[PDB]
Amino acid sequence: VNSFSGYLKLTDNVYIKNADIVEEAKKVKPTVVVNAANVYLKHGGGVAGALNKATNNAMQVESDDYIATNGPLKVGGSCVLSGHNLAKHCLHVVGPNVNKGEDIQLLKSAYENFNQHEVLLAPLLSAGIFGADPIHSLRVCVDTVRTNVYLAVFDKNLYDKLVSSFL
Numbered sequence: 572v573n574s575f576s577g578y579l580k581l582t583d584n585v586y587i588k589n590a591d592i593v594e595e596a597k598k599v600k601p602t603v604v605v606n607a608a609n610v611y612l613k614h615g616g617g618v619a620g621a622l623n624k625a626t627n628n629a630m631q632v633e634s635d636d637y638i639a640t641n642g643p644l645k646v647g648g649s650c651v652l653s654g655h656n657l658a659k660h661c662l663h664v665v666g667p668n669v670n671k672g673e674d675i676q677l678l679k680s681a682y683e684n685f686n687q688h689e690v691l692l693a694p695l696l697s698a699g700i701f702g703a704d705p706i707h708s709l710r711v712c713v714d715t716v717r718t719n720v721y722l723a724v725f726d727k728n729l730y731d732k733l734v735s736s737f738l
């Protein structure tokens with residue numbers, strides 16, 4: 572038993588809710604919240620901009636030190652940093668950005684990072700401003716992640732389409 576509430580169960584291990592991941596994170600304090608990161612950990616907009624704003628820019632400060640030491644992430648890669656006031660840890664995961672021309676096949680590699688964590692609160696990777704189809708992202712999630720994932724979908728209209736079209 573865990574503290575996630577109001578989720579619809581899609582599979583043995585994937586759950587989905589119409590929720591703001593920031594508000595969801597502040598209430599649940601999950602062990603891991605996933606950020607929709609880019610390789611530079613520049614948290615300017617979308618999920619990343621929202622999560623970072625909720626940390627009063629502490630996520631960005633930590634991220635800039637990470638990049639100065641380690642260099643950029645790979646598309647499809649991840650790093651574990653602090654969850655600040657939102658979670659114990661933040662798993663920064665880089666899905667391919669279609670608006671930058673990145674290969675969509677890298678979406679599966681991106682979701683594989685979730686398997687290193689038993690339970691996660693996450694957005695749909697490569698959705699929103701990353702330009703991929705969220706229905707495809709949900710399919711890849713279900714077919715790749717084996718650990719327990721709680722997906723927060725900000726847009727109610729999108730949440731209803733994802734559920735109604737789920738196979």
Ligand SMILES: Nc1ncnc(N2CC[C@@H](Oc3ccncc3)C2)c1Cl
Nearest residue numbers: 591592593617618621622624625725
């Ligand atoms: N998945 C998302 N994609 C893009 N923007 C989002 N947010 C939530 C509200 C606002 O973010 C904050 C964050 C901290 N204080 C007030 C508002 C935009 C989200 Cl939740």
